[PDB]
Design a protein around this ligand. Structure first.
Ligand SMILES: *C(=O)CCCCCCCCCCC
Length: 11
């Protein structure tokens, strides 16, 4: 839940 659609911004 912390990044299920946000890993390319949080690289
Ligand atoms: C949400 O984005 C999923 C990935 C983030 C890491 C979850 C870590 C906790 C897993 C164990 C839960 C009991």
């Amino acid at each position: 839940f912390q990044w299920q659609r946000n890993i390319r911004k949080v690289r």
